[PDB]
Amino acid sequence: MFVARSIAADHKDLIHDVSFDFHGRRMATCSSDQSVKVWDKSENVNWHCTASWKTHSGSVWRVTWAHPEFGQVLASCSFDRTAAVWEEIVHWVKRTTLVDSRTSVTDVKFAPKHMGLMLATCSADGVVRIYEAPDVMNLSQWSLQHEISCKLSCSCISWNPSSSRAHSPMIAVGSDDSSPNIMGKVQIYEYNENTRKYAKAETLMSVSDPVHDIAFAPNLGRSFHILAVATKDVRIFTMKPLRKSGGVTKFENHTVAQFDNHNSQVWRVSWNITGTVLASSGDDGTVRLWKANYMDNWKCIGVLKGDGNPVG
Partner 1 sequence: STAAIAGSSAAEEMVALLVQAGLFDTAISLCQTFKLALTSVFEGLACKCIRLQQGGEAAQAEAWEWLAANQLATVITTKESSATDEAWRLMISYLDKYEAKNTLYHHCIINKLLSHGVPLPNWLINRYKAMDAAELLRLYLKYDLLEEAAELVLEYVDALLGKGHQYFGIQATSQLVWFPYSAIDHLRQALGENESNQHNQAILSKLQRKMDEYFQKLKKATDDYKKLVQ
Nearer to partner 1, 169 or 218 (CB): 169
CB 215 within 8 A of CB 227: yes
Nearer to partner 1, 169 or 210 (CB): 169
CB 302 within 8 A of CB 288: yes
CA distances from 134 to 40, 163, 170, 206, 223 (A): 30, 21, 21, 39, 33
- Residue 219 Cβ vs partner 1, minimum distance, rounded to whole Å: 18
CA angle (299 as vertex; 298, 305 as ends), nearest 5: 140
Nearer to partner 1, 44 or 194 (CB): 194
Nearer to partner 1, 153 or 238 (CB): 153
Strands 105-109 and 120-123: antiparallel
Rounded CA Rg of the chain: 20
- Residue 129 Cβ vs partner 1, minimum distance, rounded to whole Å: 8
Closest CA to 215 of 227, 205, 225: 227
Nearer to partner 1, 46 or 194 (CB): 194
Q: Which residues bind partner 1 (CB under 8 A)?
A: 102, 114-116, 134-136, 143-147, 169, 194-197
Closest CA to 75 of 33, 127, 66: 66
Closest CA to 155 of 36, 61, 22, 294: 61
CB 158 within 8 A of CB 216: yes
Nearer to partner 1, 63 or 85 (CB): 85
Nearer to partner 1, 112 or 302 (CB): 112
Tell me if residue 68 falls in helix, strand or coil: helix
- Residue 144 Cβ vs partner 1, minimum distance, rounded to whole Å: 6
- Residue 81 Cβ vs partner 1, minimum distance, rounded to whole Å: 12
